[PDB]
Design a protein around this ligand. Sequence first.
Ligand SMILES: Nc1ncnc2c1ncn2[C@@H]1O[C@H](COP(=O)(O)OP(=O)(O)O)[C@@H](O)[C@H]1O
Ligand SMILES: Nc1ncnc2c1ncn2[C@@H]1O[C@H](COP(=O)(O)OP(=O)(O)O)[C@@H](O)[C@H]1O
Ligand SMILES: [Mg+2]
Ligand SMILES: [Mg+2]
Lengths: 417, 49, 49, 100, 259, 259
Amino acid sequence: MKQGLQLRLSQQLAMTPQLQQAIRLLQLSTLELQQELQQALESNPLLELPVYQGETTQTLQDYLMWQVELTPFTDTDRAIATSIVDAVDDTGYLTIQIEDIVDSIGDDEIGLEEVEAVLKRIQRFDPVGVAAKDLRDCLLIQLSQFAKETPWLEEARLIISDHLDLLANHDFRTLMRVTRLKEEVLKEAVNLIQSLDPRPGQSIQTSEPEYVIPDVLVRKVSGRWTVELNADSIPRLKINQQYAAMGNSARNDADGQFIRSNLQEARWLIKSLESRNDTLLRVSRCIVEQQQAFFEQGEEYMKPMVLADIAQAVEMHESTISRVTTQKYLHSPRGIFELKYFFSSHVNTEGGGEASSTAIRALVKKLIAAENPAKPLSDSKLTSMLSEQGIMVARRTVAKYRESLSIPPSNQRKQLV
Amino acid sequence: PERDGLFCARIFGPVKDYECLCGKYKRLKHRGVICEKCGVEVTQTKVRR
Amino acid sequence: PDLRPLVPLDGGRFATSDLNDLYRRVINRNNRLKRLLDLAAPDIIVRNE
Amino acid sequence: GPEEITADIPNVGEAALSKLDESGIVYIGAEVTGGDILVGKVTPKGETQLTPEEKLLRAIFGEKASDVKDSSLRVPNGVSGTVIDVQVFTRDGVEKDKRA
Amino acid sequence: MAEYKDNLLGEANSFLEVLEQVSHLAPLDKPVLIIGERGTGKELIASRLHYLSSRWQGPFISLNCAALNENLLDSELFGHEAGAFTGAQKRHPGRFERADGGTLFLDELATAPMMVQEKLLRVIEYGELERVGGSQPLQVNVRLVCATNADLPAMVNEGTFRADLLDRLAFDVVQLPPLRERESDIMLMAEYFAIQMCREIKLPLFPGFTERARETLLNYRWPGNIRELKNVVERSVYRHGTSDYPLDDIIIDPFKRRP
Amino acid sequence: MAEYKDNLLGEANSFLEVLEQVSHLAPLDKPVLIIGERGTGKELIASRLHYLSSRWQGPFISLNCAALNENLLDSELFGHEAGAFTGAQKRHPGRFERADGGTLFLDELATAPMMVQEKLLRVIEYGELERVGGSQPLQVNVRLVCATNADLPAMVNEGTFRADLLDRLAFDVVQLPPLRERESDIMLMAEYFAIQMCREIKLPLFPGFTERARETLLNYRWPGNIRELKNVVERSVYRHGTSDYPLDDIIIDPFKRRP
DNA sequence: AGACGGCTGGCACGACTTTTGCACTCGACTAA
DNA sequence: GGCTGATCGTGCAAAAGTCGTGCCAGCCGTCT
Ligand SMILES: Nc1ncnc2c1ncn2[C@@H]1O[C@H](COP(=O)(O)OP(=O)(O)O)[C@@H](O)[C@H]1O
Ligand SMILES: Nc1ncnc2c1ncn2[C@@H]1O[C@H](COP(=O)(O)OP(=O)(O)O)[C@@H](O)[C@H]1O
Ligand SMILES: [Mg+2]
Ligand SMILES: [Mg+2]
């Protein structure tokens, strides 16, 4: 023969189609895969205390109920108070409106005056501003709770009344122009207003751990990184040995055929599961080989990664890689992150560098965190930082990353030092 | 709560609050109505026992 | 379910024991048997379950 | 997310925070009564939508945004005494080590 | 790109003069030629120049001329797009494309096909070319480097090479001095060799040569410019196998048969 | 690092001393060249050297300059990436890439094309190269082994061989002892061949070789040093038929008629 | 007090990714 | 006919999406 690249000849079809079982195996379903396996095992018959928590935390709902019971109120007043307690947000605000509350009361005798009186009684509770549903209202109640001997009290009340917009935009100059307040003397009042404990009802909420079960665990102790999947999380199916030892002995053709079909289906399913597990392990090993460079380089200097780049590291099609990456999580000493989180776009950099979008965002966030509070860093100013990094980037598109990190506008982030 | 199992909704009664599983009809305004996407009586939690 | 609390030991796993493990075993056994009952199993097998 | 000890506990006075050091531990040799906080740890909270109320609060207060919950360590009630020493253990792969 | 050190053990007036000329040449992006003989530090000089230039940020890539297969030399040079051939499944990056913006260190300039020279002629001169299946050519820019150990003018007189190709190639060619022409201390050069060899053989310390050994080393044909010195030194070190006494007799010629 | 004596014989001659010297070279990973005519156990020597290092655990392979398809040989040296040529089903790993970290034997170096010579010299122990249709270069580790029955210095003087390749190779030269001159080891080799044949022929016992056969063997020039010796031993054993008495005849030329 | 200036923010075209919707005819015969 | 049963089966591709980066229109802070 010879070596060449002629482009006209006969050929055959591509990979044979209708591999539905393999397609499901390629996708990772985690507990959903476990549920499907349980359903199949239900279908396939040849496949196989004294200590109690006893905690009655009030959660401030019971505390509110006890306060209502301990407080003197009419039967209608008690019912209104209970209804108000029903519509309370976790942060401490009222979810429903006063008109909504009146409508839910559904009483002609019930009036807006009674609702206001109940709210004042509701305001007359610990913590102050209970179910205020308005930041100014809760702040006003909290300020009214304190004594008037404190300095900058009337000015703080006036600001909370109708000067909230300027503070929202941090419009100190506009606020000074409007309210005609003393310059730089209002900084103390602003700090005191910042010391108002927003969302006082948040203390009611108690922390609950988030049960996250990883799939792959990596140690890399003393180097020698070795990817190991969660053996406990690894599914395992058993063949019914008693059922296996009853197929040949069967004298009924129908029973024998059913046993053979069930055995074949179970064998195919077990083979598919083992192949999926092996493919996942190989993909994890390849990623860890890629992630080892990323882990050593750190989050700030994470290298860009491509789906095709990883598919090259393996022997399966990129479709299998994409399917396996779905619902994929792993554990590392640095932390636990999704497998798809590894991939990132490559940003052309000075000297031809390709910059990971995630790493670029992390570095930009670190730089923005280390910024002067009086003068927030500008997006155009971020071009200077990028040039200092020695790597080219898209400052115009960097605003997208900044918003992605939920970074407020630099002008909006401006505040008195 | 799971579906048609132990510690499940639509059986054994409502959940910690009068709120329904589908997230709709979550208020004391509803006293005995049952939601559509999830079948839940809007009642107190203590009836679960 | 209220009288048989989950009682999370580590928080990650509730491990309902001495109350639901028997329930779980009987439930899955009955589901398997009833599903198999519609498939005309051999008499020996179905009698075993 | 991870839980960090940064001594930035909301809804608490500075008087309680006086005895706590930068990372949130209490200075060695200090004395404590009742249920005072020892170490200030917080639990990250799942993010919410734009939430104009929360967005406004962050534009006003910020630096918390209800992102965390008070999970600090405090003395059991009816217990008083003083600290002899403290010990911190950090697994490898994490190198915060503010004052470790 | 401020400072870099690599080998450069040779310290001769001619060696220094070449280094100084390269230093001035290093800023220039115009293509140049390296000349010399076998084992004449050719690889080192090219690498030093490549790091030296402002393309220190850019990728310096070399290429052996005779290595290319005649079957797909055009794809090797320019490249191909996906589907251009039957086997074309992706836009294969070109060698110049890989070096686009960088430095191309052509190797064995003499040892190339005439068709190869013809193919590469206009692209270097025009600075623009296209791969197989390309819509429009790419006019990338990259400094060009090439070398050969033969007398290019002799080949041109023989017509062995395209006169125009070399003509639009020889902006300030660079030559090398022979080992016999190398007046640098051969003993000093071999000192680093002895140190590295003692390290490699895990020997305690270099036993050192003798005055007669030094005189004989001076009295050497040295057809191999550097490697032969390195190779003969390594052979003598391996044969000696003892730091108890300094080296006095050195085996060089492999043709001779021992007793 | 095991004994693995395997086919170790003929120590009466200075081949034993040659093996002793090669034992020192066994830990070495530098270039290796072997000298000797065909039929001199050169492959056996190379195998012993490769096995000698615990790097025998590494991939030890052999290759001879058999052209086959020149393009195919070029690809095998280079390594065909997937889709490089029309119809390429998948990436074909290179012959060099197959054995990294382990010894590689290069044979028929005399019978190597000059273009093939240049291709090999491209990575002249350079250690890094690029695959056929390879995007980025790869660097591997392997100790090459060289052997030929021809006078490389002569061909270099003749210009047939590549002088740069010769310099890049043959850090050590292993000259095969003349088995035609190794008369003392001839008797021991005959005994070993007889033992092997008795293992193979499975007859009652070896009658012997008398002395006429030994005298004829002494008269025989034995152009095939180690290969033809065993072949003639087998042929004579077969022709002898009955093993009642020691055989004195010698099966010299099978091409010549038996009678 | 109107204009520069950087922000902001959506809209656009390339450039990488991606999910799902896909099973012949066997080798048994099958004979009316 | 009427599909009818069955070795043996580790993509793929193709239209779809989705992002990268730039590119223009408005806006307020401001100082001339
Ligand atoms: N100044 C130097 N410092 C160190 N090594 C040198 C120097 N000059 C030459 N060499 C040696 O010369 C060798 C390179 O020779 P080179 O001309 O590249 O071979 P070829 O002629 O086959 O291209 C290197 O192995 C290097 O050790
Ligand atoms: N010292 C020895 N002991 C045993 N067998 C040997 C010895 N030397 C050579 N041989 C054998 O002689 C045979 C012929 O050698 P030869 O034809 O030179 O092999 P090659 O040509 O592949 O190098 C070899 O197969 C080898 O096994
Ligand atoms: Mg060289
Ligand atoms: Mg051999």
